[PDB]
Amino acid sequence: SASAVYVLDLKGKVLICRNYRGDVDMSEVEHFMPILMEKEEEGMLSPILAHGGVRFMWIKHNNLYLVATSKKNACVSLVFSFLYKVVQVFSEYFKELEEESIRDNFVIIYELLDELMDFGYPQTTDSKILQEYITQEAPRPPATVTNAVSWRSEGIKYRKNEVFLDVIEAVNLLVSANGNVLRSEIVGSIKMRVFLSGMPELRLGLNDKVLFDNTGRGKSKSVELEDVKFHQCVRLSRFENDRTISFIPPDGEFELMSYRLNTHVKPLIWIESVIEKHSHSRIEYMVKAKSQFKRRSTANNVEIHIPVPNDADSPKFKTTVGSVKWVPENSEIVWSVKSFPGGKEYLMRAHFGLPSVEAEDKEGKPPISVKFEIPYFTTSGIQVRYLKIIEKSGYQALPWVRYITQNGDYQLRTQ
Amino acid sequence: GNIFANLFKGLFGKKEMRILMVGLDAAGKTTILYKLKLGEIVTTIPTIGFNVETVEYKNISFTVWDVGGQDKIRPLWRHYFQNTQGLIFVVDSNDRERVNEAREELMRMLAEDELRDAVLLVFANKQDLPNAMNAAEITDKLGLHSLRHRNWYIQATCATSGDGLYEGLDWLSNQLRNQK
Amino acid sequence: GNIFANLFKGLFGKKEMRILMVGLDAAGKTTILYKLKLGEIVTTIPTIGFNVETVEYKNISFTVWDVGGQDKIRPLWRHYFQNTQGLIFVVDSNDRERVNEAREELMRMLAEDELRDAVLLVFANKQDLPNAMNAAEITDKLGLHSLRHRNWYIQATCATSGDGLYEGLDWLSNQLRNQK
Amino acid sequence: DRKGGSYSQAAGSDSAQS
Amino acid sequence: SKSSVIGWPAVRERMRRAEPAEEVGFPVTPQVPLRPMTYKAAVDLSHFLKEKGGLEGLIHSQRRQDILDLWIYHTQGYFPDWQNYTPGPGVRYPLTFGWCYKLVPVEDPEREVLEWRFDSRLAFHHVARELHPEYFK
Ligand SMILES: Nc1nc2c(ncn2[C@@H]2O[C@H](COP(=O)(O)OP(=O)(O)OP(=O)(O)O)[C@@H](O)[C@H]2O)c(=O)[nH]1
Ligand SMILES: Nc1nc2c(ncn2[C@@H]2O[C@H](COP(=O)(O)OP(=O)(O)OP(=O)(O)O)[C@@H](O)[C@H]2O)c(=O)[nH]1
Ligand SMILES: [Mg+2]
Ligand SMILES: [Mg+2]
Asked: What is the enclosing helix (H) or strand (E) of A318?
């Protein structure tokens, strides 16, 4: 129940604001900046500010704070969802999120803000649907918004019906400094880039553990996703009844389903780090990386970030495989590897000096994070079975999909 | 099929072989690996992870992967069990308190059916103090004669001097290769 | 890459080297430094801070940084360890009571993991009174033979005259420079 | 080609489940 | 199918070697389509196995069935899930319609000895589906 959603800037200047209820004076935005400065300087800064009886909820964008003031006990979650939808719409319409576009497309920006929500109640959220009525370069509103299918525009015609899927894997590993992995969760991501003619209704079928058990085929390798969240086009009733994944695919790239379950397998990369840090004399980086993934798989663009000392200087690198570059901006050593075949073992020996003068304050021990990304690898073993592409006119579809395994929250606690 | 290329390669030497370096921390494994690779007494910080190097001797490229003996790194030796042909255990005769822990770790490592073709390789490190035992007392304490289907040999090597490493390398080559 | 310019520079002498000046207060360090740089005994007040100078001899610029022996300046020697390749120690054989303190300070300074590539350079100062010890009694008292991995050389120099300074410089050049 | 795993053809449904 | 014929002898030898009673990861060949076996494909595979032999009358075992499913997946891209047997006790009917192979007793259901038997009526009669309507959806 936000009173007015506004777009601010890094210097406190409001790029654009649009009142929806009018219950709060527009001059309250001036006090938002001092309140944020005080909260940050005292550690009490939070996304939802509070200026007396009015709460100033704001989120940090690429360059501006999307502040949405409110007065009553409105749905904070609803405000957050509206802000996320607005951010997605801005990203779709504007390729850049900075002050260069905020002051460059205000003519269409005002119309989009007016059309998106009214009186604090969001009404339009389809970026593709909104692009059919609001353009920066007007006809009646499309019937798709009025119709039940607001995620599949009818009448779309394509020369070919090719859909590019994406089996994106997220390997999140939380290895403590004691050597044990605490948080080992893998989040699936079934994203498809559908480009076909008409309004096809995808009939998804994969190797799910629940589906195999229900059909009686619970004996092969089936993925038991702890959390499975369908997209907007996905029908909740069909999945609730018999795990029937039937929905109308959108026009373009969209996230249909996203698996989320814990992992009980060994890490794909085993990283052993050593710290022979002399007392203000030198430091040793006994970093050893063991690839626990299958030898048939290669981790392309592997970047094992090793945090070096804050005041460290004059580093010397004695490694075996992979380029090592010390970036002073990040204050860490990135064990950069172009391609890392599975089962590889790379040994590195860092050595640098330290200033004689001791530091006045501690710097902390940031965790070691790697940026491995091995495509065409399915650690979870979930295999897609079929995708029921049905059209009223009738056409032969040629769906495509690629499985990509990358490194997510794969942080390693430092000693 | 024809195997003329294999015979031509073997006429000049083709076999390389492999090796593994495991043991307790501060057991001289890193120093032994450095001496095998370079031949100098190099000082290094404790091995948080592992070191992999190769040694060319007797026409065999004996690649040895050193592994530390840290508590958090002790269970990380299972990653090296894939595609492994040899295994070397480094004992610490100067650490009476850690002798039981080293023996338990060695028993746990040898109690895996995956590491079956790798013969036992025990090297007596820290052979510079009078407290070091002989080549039989350490074997008797470790019970190397009770390892069924395991070819174990005890060799004493001094990290500071480097003597005895050649005998251990020759024994490993003889165990790996059974030709002239 | 090409190293022709380096060879051309080294044809007439390119290596410079460094040096350090440590020891207790009133040990002849300032006078010794003045004699090495100028060639005369200059009377100076106690070294509250330090003296930095350079000397060109044998085509090598041996930079010398004097370090005091004050109680508040004793722990400041760690600052000079950075970017230091050489070190010269000046002993005070005329102070029997301060001999133990000097030996303890030398042992503490010799127990630094950063100062390892610098060999021992002991200068026997105050070699003009009958109470001054020989080149072996002082070394035996300080236990210079027990410094493992340290290239120590004992030289006796007279502050009033300057005998033996050239011998010490030649020994330092031979220890540092390993060419013809 | 393309980094992240080459695109592969997909079926229409579980032919083995009728 | 020359590749299927070549793989049939080795697969049969491996199945015979395995008695009736190491690498991690899920590598996938690039660009190889993956889908469940079809009824016509299952019928063709059953006919080929019957003609070449080594499948009819062989003692049913989990390891042999897994090896056969893996070989079929490698040679054709068919998921090793259509080669399922109906729940016991007694004769186990094929899970996928069109399959010509079934497991029958040869003498707890796990302790019963089963043998693969050819059945042409299986490709035309959904005996397993009739027995377990819930499993067929
Ligand atoms: N003085 C002396 N010390 C030895 C000798 N042999 C072994 N050591 C000790 O053993 C340690 C061996 O360290 P490294 O070989 O570099 O590493 P490591 O044996 O793999 O032990 P970790 O790094 O903890 O896994 C040294 O720090 C020595 O203190 C020896 O012959 N003489
Ligand atoms: N008479 C005489 N005195 C000497 C001789 N050598 C050293 N000394 C004494 O040692 C003292 C050393 O003075 P400096 O060399 O100028 O300074 P320093 O050695 O760095 O001593 P501090 O400045 O106090 O740290 C002098 O004051 C002398 O009294 C010597 O050969 N003859
Ligand atoms: Mg080591
Ligand atoms: Mg002085």
From this structure: strand A313-319
